[PDB]
Amino acid sequence: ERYFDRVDENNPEYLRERNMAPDLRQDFNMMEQKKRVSMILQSPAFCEELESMIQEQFKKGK
Amino acid sequence: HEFEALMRMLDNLGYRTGYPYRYPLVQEKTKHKSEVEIPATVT
Amino acid sequence: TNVPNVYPAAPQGGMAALNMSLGMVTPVNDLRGSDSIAYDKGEKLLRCKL
Amino acid sequence: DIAALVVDNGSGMCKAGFAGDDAPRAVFPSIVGRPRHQGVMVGMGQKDSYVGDEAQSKRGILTLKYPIEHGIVTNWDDMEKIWHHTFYNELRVAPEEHPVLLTEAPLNPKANREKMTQIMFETFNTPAMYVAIQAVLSLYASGRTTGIVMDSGDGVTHTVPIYEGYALPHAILRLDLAGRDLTDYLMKILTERGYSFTTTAEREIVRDIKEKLCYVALDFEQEMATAASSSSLEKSYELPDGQVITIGNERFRCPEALFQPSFLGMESCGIHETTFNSIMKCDVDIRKDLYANTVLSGGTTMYPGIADRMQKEITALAPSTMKIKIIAPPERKYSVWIGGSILASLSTFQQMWISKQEYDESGPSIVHRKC
Ligand SMILES: Nc1ncnc2c1ncn2[C@@H]1O[C@H](COP(=O)(O)OP(=O)(O)O)[C@@H](O)[C@H]1O
């Protein structure tokens, strides 16, 4: 009995599994396979450049 | 090796010299090996 | 149609004027632009200083 | 651990997620549906209006309308409904506890930003909210700070060049040629095959057809010759009622309106010509980098073969000595949100947030002071 093992209405964040489009099913898996947001933050050389660029663009204007 | 650099100095400003360089020189933009950069789709 | 300008030279100071003309033609810091990401700030600073 | 929220809005798609996450938590169309048929069944579930993913399920009994067209909102109440559904039903988080990050088109009227800020502070009691440019965030998601970016959504197409983190306001080019107009053109050219679609649900069906069975031709005349002289370029779509249609010749005809707007009769030029003109408006010294870094963004640029045709058309107008390359990330649909997820995560960005208390003495114009 898999059907007794779990219930669709017990967990809403398991209920999200049923109502997915197939291309939406790939987009999440591929995008957390890539981990781009983790890559940008973990890599320093681009990171402090972005840091200081935002800070000193605030410094003179906007 | 000392003459080539002097003569390239002379060519840079506009002295239209006809001296043939034995060693050709190219300036190119530097290459990246950060993991952020994505390769281009085509050549 | 016009070559980059050359500053007139002293009889004993020709190559100083040569260097200053070349430096006004070619900037010593050309990494600014798309190559800023290629090198980190600490190494780019040393390259500029040297 | 209070984390910021990133909410990306575009005409036809709303995404939302916590800052610092790889994936947005909620993705759903920006649709509002109201019942059209006489509802007679006492005691079962009826509602005044359906919104979001639930509204798309019941397309048969609903009239579906979009609150945003061409990047400009038409009815603000529907926008409030979508924002409330995003904050409460999708993420189940209080809007007044976490800061929220918002995006918009670069060129837009004055009143949009002010009304958006007023609604976001007054209705939801947001302690801090910031407005950012979509295309700039897409370039940050690509991870290069320089280059010219092309973001083409379902509302409007725009190319902006960004040099050293600054987007030049004079060189920004905007063209009102989007995917919804392509859907309308595809419906008009499917009329002549014998299949007729008129209602809004049929427009969504046509949009799904366009997403599944469209591609960009490398040579337009040669592909017309091949499609006329052979039946190889024919695919069959299977309708939700069981009927089967043959898309046939039209597959490369609908996206080609992106390059030649003379099919739609628009006065403006093509998208590649728009990108080329935007590059021409910039300074000469940076043009090399503008030809060296070009990324594609938006769901409209997911047509197969868009990169090769774009590169060829840019190379045709470019000087012979220039080098042309086109960057197309596979996740170009959700790049903008990813950029937002970068921008809220920085340690220098906490001072960039708009203060709730400062808005009290400033007012709705405060964003024009700070952004
Ligand atoms: N897989 C796909 N292939 C081709 N076109 C697509 C695909 N997915 C979406 N589109 C087109 O892109 C549009 C959605 O663009 P979107 O990225 O949502 O714009 P925005 O987010 O700026 O509103 C849709 O109208 C659709 O026509």
For residues D60-70, one letter each, b for 16 or more C-beta atoms within 10 angstroms of the residue's C-beta and e for the rest, the string is eebebebbbbb
Check: CB of residue D144 under 8 Å from CB of residue C34: yes
Which residue CA neighbors atom 1 of ligand 1 most closely?
Answer: D211
**Structural domain for D233, as ranges:** 179-258
CB-based contacts of D286: which residues, under 8 Å, 6+ apart?
A: C33, D146, D161, D163
Check: CB of residue D337 under 8 Å from CB of residue D15: yes
Pairing of the two strands D68-69 and D72-73? antiparallel
Q: What is the phi/psi pair of residue D267, to 5°?
A: -75, -30
**Amino acid residing at D322:** M
Which residue CA neighbors atom 27 of ligand 1 most closely?
Answer: D179
User: What does the alpha-carbon distance between residue D269 and residue D182 come to, in Å, rounded to a whole number?
Assistant: 16
User: What does the alpha-carbon distance between residue D210 and residue D187 come to, in Å, rounded to a whole number?
Assistant: 10
What experiment produced this structure?
Answer: cryo-EM
Pairing of the two strands D294-297 and D147-152? parallel
Provide the CA D146 distance to its chain's centre, in angstroms. 22
The secondary structure of residue D327, as a DSSP letter, is: B
Structure tokens, B38: 């994505």
Give the mutation candidate from B32, B36, B37 for the C interface (greatest C CB count, under 10 A): B32
CA dihedral A21, A24, A29, A30 (to 10 degrees): 140
> CA geometry: angle at D263 spanning D106 and D300, to 5°?
40
User: What does the alpha-carbon distance between residue D44 and residue D66 come to, in Å, rounded to a whole number?
Assistant: 27
User: What does the alpha-carbon distance between residue D163 and residue D171 come to, in Å, rounded to a whole number?
Assistant: 11
Positions of E strands within chain D: 5-10, 13-18, 26-28, 32-35, 50-51, 62-65, 68-69, 72-73, 100-104, 129-133, 147-152, 157-163, 166-167, 173-175, 236-238, 244-246, 294-297
Contact between D308 and B42 using a beta-carbon 8 Å cutoff:
yes
Q: Half-sphere exposure (CA, 13 Å, Cβ side) for D24?
A: 27
**Amino acid residing at A14:** Y
Q: What is the CA radius of gyration of chain C?
A: 15
Residue B5 alpha carbon to ligand 1 centre in Å: 56
Which residues on C lie below 8 Å from B34 (Cβ)? 37-38
User: What does the alpha-carbon distance between residue D190 and residue D203 come to, in Å, rounded to a whole number?
Assistant: 12
What resolution, expressed in A, was reported for this entry?
3.5
User: What does the alpha-carbon distance between residue D334 and residue D141 come to, in Å, rounded to a whole number?
Assistant: 9
Q: What is the phi/psi pair of residue D149, to 5°?
A: -110, 145
Residue A27 contacts D, CB cutoff 8 Å: yes
Check: CB of residue D339 under 8 Å from CB of residue D140: yes
Helix or strand (DSSP H, E) at A51: helix A44-60
Check: CB of residue C41 under 8 Å from CB of residue C48: no
> According to the 3-state scheme, what is the secondary structure of D16-76?
EEECCCCCCCEEECCCEEEECCCCCCCCCCCCCCEECHHHHHCCCCEEEECCEECCEECCH
- Give the domain CATH number at D201: 3.90.640.10
**Amino acid residing at C32:** R
Structure tokens, D111: 């009143």
Choose among D238, D119, D105, D122: nearest CA to D178: D105
Check: CB of residue D304 under 8 Å from CB of residue D215: yes
Locate the ligand 1 atom nearest the alpha carbon of residue D10 and give its number: 23
Structure tokens, D214: 């469209």
Give the mutation candidate from D138, D139, D140, D144 for the B interface (greatest B CB count, under 10 A): D144
CA distance B2 to chain D (A): 32
User: What does the alpha-carbon distance between residue D237 and residue D235 come to, in Å, rounded to a whole number?
Assistant: 7
**Amino acid residing at A50:** L
Check: CB of residue D59 under 8 Å from CB of residue D369: no
Q: What is the length of chain C? A: 50
Q: CA separation (Å) from D212 to D75, D171, D205?
A: 31, 34, 11
Which residue CA neighbors atom 19 of ligand 1 most closely?
Answer: D153
Residue with tokens 């093509």, as numbered in its chain: D270
Count of A-B CB contacts under 8 Å: 9
* Ligand 1 first shell, C-beta below 6 A: D 10-13, 153-155, 179-180, 207, 210-211, 298-300, 302-303, 333
Residue numbers after which chain B is interrupted (C to N above 2.5 A) read: none
